[PDB]
Each structure stands twice: as C-alpha cells, then as structure tokens.
Amino acid sequence: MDDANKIRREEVLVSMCDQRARMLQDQFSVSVNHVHALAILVSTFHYHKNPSAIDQETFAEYTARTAFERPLLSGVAYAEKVVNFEREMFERQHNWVIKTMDRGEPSPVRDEYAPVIFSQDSVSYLESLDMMSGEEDRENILRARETGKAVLTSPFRLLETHHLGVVLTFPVYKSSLPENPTVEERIAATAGYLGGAFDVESLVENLLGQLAGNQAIVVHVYDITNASDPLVMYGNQDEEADRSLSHESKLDFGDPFRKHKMICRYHQ
Amino acid sequence: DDANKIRREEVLVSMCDQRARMLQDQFSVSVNHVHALAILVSTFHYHKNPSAIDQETFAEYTARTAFERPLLSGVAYAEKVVNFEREMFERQHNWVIKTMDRGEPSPVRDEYAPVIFSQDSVSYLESLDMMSGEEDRENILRARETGKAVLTSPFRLLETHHLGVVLTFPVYKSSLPENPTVEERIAATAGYLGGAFDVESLVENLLGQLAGNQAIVVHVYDITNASDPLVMYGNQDESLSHESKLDFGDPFRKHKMICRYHQ
Numbered sequence: 001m002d003d004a005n006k007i008r009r010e011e012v013l014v015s016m017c018d019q020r021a022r023m024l025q026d027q028f029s030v031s032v033n034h035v036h037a038l039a040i041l042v043s044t045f046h047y048h049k050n051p052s053a054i055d056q057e058t059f060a061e062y063t064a065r066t067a068f069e070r071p072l073l074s075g076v077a078y079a080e081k082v083v084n085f086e087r088e089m090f091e092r093q094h095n096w097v098i099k100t101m102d103r104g105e106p107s108p109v110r111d112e113y114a115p116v117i118f119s120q121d122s123v124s125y126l127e128s129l130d131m132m133s134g135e136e137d138r139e140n141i142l143r144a145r146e147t148g149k150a151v152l153t154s155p156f157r158l159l160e161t162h163h164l165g166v167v168l169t170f171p172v173y174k175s176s177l178p179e180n181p182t183v184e185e186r187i188a189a190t191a192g193y194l195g196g197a198f199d200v201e202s203l204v205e206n207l208l209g210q211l212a213g214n215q216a217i218v219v220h221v222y223d224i225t226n227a228s229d230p231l232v233m234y235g236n237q238d239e240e241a242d243r244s245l246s247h248e249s250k251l252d253f254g255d256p257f258r259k260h261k262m263i264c265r266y267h268q
Numbered sequence: 269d270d271a272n273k274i275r276r277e278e279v280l281v282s283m284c285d286q287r288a289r290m291l292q293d294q295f296s297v298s299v300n301h302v303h304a305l306a307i308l309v310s311t312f313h314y315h316k317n318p319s320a321i322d323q324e325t326f327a328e329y330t331a332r333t334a335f336e337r338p339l340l341s342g343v344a345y346a347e348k349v350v351n352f353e354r355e356m357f358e359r360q361h362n363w364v365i366k367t368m369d370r371g372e373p374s375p376v377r378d379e380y381a382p383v384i385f386s387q388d389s390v391s392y393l394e395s396l397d398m399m400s401g402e403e404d405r406e407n408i409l410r411a412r413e414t415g416k417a418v419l420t421s422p423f424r425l426l427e428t429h430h431l432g433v434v435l436t437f438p439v440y441k442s443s444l445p446e447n448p449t450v451e452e453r454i455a456a457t458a459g460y461l462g463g464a465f466d467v468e469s470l471v472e473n474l475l476g477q478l479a480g481n482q483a484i485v486v487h488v489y490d491i492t493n494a495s496d497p498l499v500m501y502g503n504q505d506e507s508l509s510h511e512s513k514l515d516f517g518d519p520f521r522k523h524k525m526i527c528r529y530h531q
C-alpha cells in the first residue's frame with residue numbers, strides 16, 4: 001500500500017522492462033548479423049565459386065551447426081530470383097515445379113518468382129515455395145533488393161506453425177552490381193534473397209519465461225510503424241494486468257522502415 | 269567534499285563499467301564469429317570431399333565478413349601436419365613449412381601447424397608453423413584438448429609488434445567420437461582456426477575516442493596468476509580506483525578492467 005514502497009515498485013518495473021528490451025534487441029541484432037554472414041556465404045561459395053560449393057545438403061549442415069548463432073530465428077533459407085522467361089528452364093534443371101505458399105500447388109504464371117532452393121531442415125517445408133506468393137514476404141523481398149539492406153515484415157502468422165512472428169530478408173546480388181548502384185541497378189543485379197523467420201511467439205516466450213521475476217510481469221511488444229494502427233508482435237493484449245502502472249521500453253530492430261516498443265506491467 | 273565526492277565516485281563506476289561492457293561485448297561477438305569460421309572450415313574443407321574451400325575463397329569470405337570480427341586484426345587456418353606427412357604436404361602446397369621467428373625452413377618436429385588459409389590482412393602467416401611460437405603452441409594444444417576456444421596471455425604479435433592476445437578454436441575430423449576423451453580429441457584434430465586480438469591498436473581505437481577519456485586512467489589486466497598480473501591494455505604504472513568485471517570466455521584465463529582518475 002505504502003507510497004514510498006510504490007516508488008520502489010515502479011523502479012523495479014522500469015529496471016525489469018528495460019533489461020528485457022535490451023536482451024530482445026541485442027539477440028535480434030546478433031541474429032541479423034549472422035544472417036548477413038550467410039548472405040555473404042551464398043554469394044562467395046555458391047555464386048562466385050566455379051563450381052558452386054553449396055548444395056541443399058551443405059546448406060542444411062552448415063545452418064544446423066550454426067543455429068546457435070541465430071538465437072531468435074526458427075530457420076533460414078535462400079530463395080533464388082527467377083523471371084518468367086527462365087521458369088521452364090529453372091524447373092527442368094531442378095526437377096521440380098515452383099509452388100505457391102498458400103496451398104503448395106504449382107504456381108500460376110507471374111512476372112517473377114522467389115522459389116526457395118536451400119533451406120535449414122527446421123524450415124524444409126519452404127523448399128520450392130515461391131516466397132513472392134505471400135504478401136508479407138513479397139513486400140520484404142522487394143524492399144530488401146531495392147535498399148540493399150536487411151528488412152523486416154509486420155507481424156503475421158508464419159507457415160506451418162502459424163506462430164505469430166516476423167520475417168527478416170537480406171538481398172544477394174550478382175557480381176555485376178555497379179559501385180554506388182541506383183535502385184534500378186540493384187533490381188537488375190539481384191540474384192536472390194536470404195531470409196529467416198523470427199518466431200516471436202515461441203522463441204521470445206522461451207527467452208522471457210526463463211528470467212527471474214517473469215511471473216510478476218506482463219510483457220507486450222508492438223509494431224508501431226503506423227502510429228494509429230499499432231500491431232501486436234508479442235503478448236496477450238488484454239490479459240489480467242495492472243491497469244494503474246506501466247512502463248515503455250525502447251526497442252530498435254534495425255530496419256528504419258519499422259518502429260517497435262515494449263510495454264510492461266505487473267500482473268496484479 | 270562531500271556530496272561532490274559521492275558524485276565523483278558514481279561517475280567513475282559508470283564510466284568504467286560501460287567501457288568494460290563495450291569491450292566484453294565486442295570480444296564476445298568476435299569469438300562467436302570465429303566459431304562460425306571454424307564450423308565453415310570443418311563443413312567445407314573436411315566434410316565435403318573433395319574439399320570445397322581454398323585460399324582464394326577463404327580470403328574472399330573473411331574479407332567480406334571482417335566487420336563481424338571487430339577486435340581481430342585477421343583470421344587464419346593452420347592445418348595439423350605430423351612429420352611423416354610433411355613431404356607429401358609440402359609437395360601438395362608447393363612450399364616449405366617455415367619457422368615464425370626467421371621464416372626459415374622448419375627443422376624436423378614431431379608435428380606442425382602451418383597456416384594454409386589466411387585473411388589478406390595477415391597474409392604473412394601463410395606457411396608459418398604456428399607451433400614455432402610458444403604462446404601460439406600452448407594455445408593450439410589447449411584448444412585441441414578442450415574442444416573450446418582459448419586465449420593466450422598478452423604478447424607482442426607478428427609483423428606489427430602490437431601487444432595482443434591470440435584466440436584459437438580447434439577444428440576436428442568427422443571421426444571424432446561423441447563425448448570424446450582428450451586422447452580421442454587429439455587423434456581427431458584437423459587444425460586450428462585463430463586470430464589476433466590487437467589490443468594495443470584496436471582496443472585503443474574503441475576506448476580512446478570516448479567522451480571523458482582524458483579524465484581517467486584505464487587498464488586491462490590478465491590476472492590468471494593473481495600474484496603476477498600482466499598488462500593487456502594501458503601503461504606500466506604499479507588511491508580511488510574501481511574494478512570492473514570482464515569475462516573473455518576462456519575459463520583458463522581471468523581478466524579485469526581498472527579505472528582511476530588522473531588527479
């Protein structure tokens with residue numbers, strides 16, 4: 001009840017929330033950095049090396065053995081850019097058809113596609129799926145290749161698991177990319193897309209659930225890219241929580257196109 | 269005195285702790301990225317047959333990922349070569365295994381750790397037997413016997429003579445058993461992936477540009493032997509200090525940061 005004890009109660013909330021935000025941000029940053037390395041791996045060992053050192057078996061092995069490097073990711077995969085003019089050739093070479101993500105059916109005719117050719121076994125169900133056949137993934141692919149940098153989706157329910165998460169995508173370019181490229185040049189030089197699923201629902205719960213004092217606190221994370229349309233990224237927004245006091249902790253997941261925040265309250 | 273003294277202490281603690289965290293974190297990021305490179309050499313050079321990694325490819329990949337390893341001046345891969353294999357090895361590589369101190373052809377040794385892949389920043393390592401330097405040799409043995417990353421004491425690095433510490437990870441053959449004994453680890457050793465933490469230059473770059481640097485004296489000590497602390501960073505000087513914690517990830521070594529005001 002005490003007013004002095006209430007001041008310390010807020011102090012503890014601030015400290016607990018800020019620490020959890022720092023942990024989330026750092027672990028995401030670590031994962032993004034190692035995804036960047038994998039993009040460079042595909043460029044160096046698949047494209048530049050004659051012949052390629054990377055087949056599906058090799059990609060699976062290397063990503064499984066390095067899974068610890070990418071803590072908030074459920075899996076990574078590499079999608080190759082395929083223009084329609086090339087599709088029949090691509091399918092014949094690979095001995096499979098490009099499929100849609102919603103039903104795993106043969107893709108209808110599209111101007112281009114992003115079929116997954118390499119996958120971590122944890123996301124093996126992505127193999128042959130056109131990652132341009134989901135809207136979140138399509139928008140990410142385009143912004144990745146146009147900006148040259150890592151990009152994040154809005155929160156959505158991921159394939160197979162239906163877990164609420166976000167996808168991270170990095171562009172991979174051909175050696176023909178000019179120095180100081182225009183966006184038009186980036187697009188022309190695009191080889192493909194190295195992506196990873198941040199399974200927020202499962203893996204952030206796992207992270208937070210092991211911390212001392214977790215039962216005392218309610219943690220929510222929001223995508224606030226659009227001020228007037230905040231989107232839940234993590235948490236049950238409306239569970240029994242202490243309505244009188246909250247704290248907002250800063251989060252920066254590294255994509256200037258997106259904005260995020262964490263909000264913590266006590267249970268009772 | 270006196271309220272101002274309290275504030276002065278609180279500033280020192282904050283300054284020192286922040287510098288310590290920054291250094292530990294950058295070290296940790298580098299170690300993790302070096303572990304990934306050890307895994308890459310294993311996957312591409314040993315698990316694939318024929319090998320699908322070479323000097324050109326290693327140099328390209330390490331150059332492009334240099335940003336991932338902030339306190340490291342360079343990385344290289346040294347392969348385990350036992351004496352009976354030396355003739356075949358030298359014929360395959362078209363060069364002789366050389367000593368670190370003079371670059372002379374190595375006298376006969378039971379085994380050697382010649383650098384076969386190198387980042388171009390440490391190109392001078394190529395063909396050098398990393399067992400011909402005592403700090404590197406001890407590191408190599410402990411890396412292979414423990415199965416984990418290891419650090420040297422502070423010592424002066426090749427070429428630059430900068431004071432630094434070497435990080436080594438073991439790379440094993442697929443014949444390594446599960447829950448191996450140390451004898452099994454040695455027998456299954458393929459090589460050693462290492463790099464030099466150039467403390468003198470790169471930690472100075474990290475800490476020296478920070479606001480308030482002119483007001484404090486910062487040291488980092490290797491305190492593995494409490495009775496013989498060894499300077500890793502700072503001057504050779506021997507009231508109000510503060511000790512900030514550091515953990516660079518090798519249980520065999522211990523370190524600490526000490527900060528003091530000038531006056």
Ligand SMILES: C[C@@H](CO)CCNc1ncnc2nc[nH]c12
Pocket residue numbers: 075076077078079116123126131134137140141157158159167168169170193194195196197
């Ligand atoms: C391979 C890359 C290409 O940028 C996207 C990964 N995208 C995804 N990865 C895993 N699960 C998903 N569920 C929906 N999208 C997903």
Ligand SMILES: C[C@@H](CO)CCNc1ncnc2nc[nH]c12
Pocket residue numbers: 342343344345346383390398401404407408424425426434435436437460461462463464
């Ligand atoms: C390739 C690895 C094998 O453990 C050692 C790196 N060791 C070193 N790397 C760079 N400079 C050095 N100066 C002295 N030793 C050095």
